[PDB]
Amino acid sequence: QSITDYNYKKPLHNDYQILDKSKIFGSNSGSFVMYSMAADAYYIYNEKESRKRYSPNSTYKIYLAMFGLDRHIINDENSRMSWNHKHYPFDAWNKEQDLNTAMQNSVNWYFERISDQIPKNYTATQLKQLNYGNKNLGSYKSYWMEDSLKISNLEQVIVFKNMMEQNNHFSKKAKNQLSSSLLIKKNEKYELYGKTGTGIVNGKYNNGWFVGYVITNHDKYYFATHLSDGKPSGKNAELISEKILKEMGVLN
Numbered sequence: 001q002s003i004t005d006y007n008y009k010k011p012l013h014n015d016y017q018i019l020d021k022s023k024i025f026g027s028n029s030g031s032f033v034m035y036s037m038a039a040d041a042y043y044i045y046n047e048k049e050s051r052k053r054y055s056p057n058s059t060y061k062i063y064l065a066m067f068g069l070d071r072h073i074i075n076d077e078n079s080r081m082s083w084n085h086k087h088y089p090f091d092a093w094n095k096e097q098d099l100n101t102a103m104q105n106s107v108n109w110y111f112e113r114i115s116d117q118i119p120k121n122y123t124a125t126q127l128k129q130l131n132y133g134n135k136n137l138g139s140y141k142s143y144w145m146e147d148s149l150k151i152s153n154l155e156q157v158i159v160f161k162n163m164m165e166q167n168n169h170f171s172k173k174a175k176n177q178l179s180s181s182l183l184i185k186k187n188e189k190y191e192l193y194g195k196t197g198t199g200i201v202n203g204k205y206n207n208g209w210f211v212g213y214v215i216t217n218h219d220k221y222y223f224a225t226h227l228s229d230g231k232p233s234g235k236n237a238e239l240i241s242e243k244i245l246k247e248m249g250v251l252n
């Protein structure tokens with residue numbers, strides 16, 4: 001909307017390292033950002049592109065889940081929601097959900113039902129405290145889905161790291177419940193947590209995301225891949241993230 005709604009220009013006062021992951025990105029365009037907790041350092045492929053703000057799409061379900069937990073819309077004993085019989089094109093959406101199944105299968109209606117219960121003033125307060133991108137709530141409907149609210153790839157990392165790692169307003173039990181819903185892979189070497197997002201505009205992919213974090217025995221890393229062109233889907237952003245993280249030594 002405004003002059004600053006499409007970019008993040010705040011300096012990184014940290015140590016940062018330029019990466020070249022162009023061979024992994026291939027015919028896709030976008031950026032990758034990682035932050036290491038132990039190093040207090042950022043690692044960025046395509047820094048210019050990492051500061052452009054895009055709709056977060058389904059990655060904002062991270063924040064809707066945290067808000068839903070914070071406001072006691074869902075909890076640790078019961079995060080179940082019944083299906084209202086509206087037919088969806090995916091069978092995984094046509095059934096009862098809890099936080100885990102909704103996050104895993106990116107069930108939009110579950111998060112929409114959460115958002116409907118959240119008053120605009122609370123969201124505005126939270127996006128301000130979190131420094132969430134352009135903080136633009138617009139019409140306040142599905143404002144995170146190809147709409148007013150935009151965030152950069154660099155901000156996806158900073159905002160998620162700060163939300164989880166600072167001693168703040170969100171409880172440890174909420175943070176733990178969200179983490180459980182985001183767990184993708186666990187083995188002897190690492191735990192990988194994350195969430196995809198895919199935007200579709202006029203039948204074409206236009207905006208792919210995979211935002212998450214890795215816990216190893218030595219460190220914790222927050223990361224995000226954004227795709228703006230080529231085949232810009234969440235699925236592809238996840239594949240790219242895994243290839244990059246592997247090369248960097250984060251996954252062993």
Ligand SMILES: *C(=O)[C@@H](NC(=O)c1ccccc1-c1ccccc1C(=O)O)[C@@H]1N[C@@H](C(=O)O)C(C)(C)S1
Pocket residue numbers: 056057058059089105106108145146195196197198199200201233234235
């Ligand atoms: C998350 O971003 C999300 N996005 C969408 O569903 C979406 C966004 C914009 C336009 C269309 C759609 C969409 C996708 C699938 C089916 C129907 C529709 C629609 O509204 O017509 C949900 N998350 C994605 C992810 O990558 O995790 C998803 C593709 C699983 S769907």
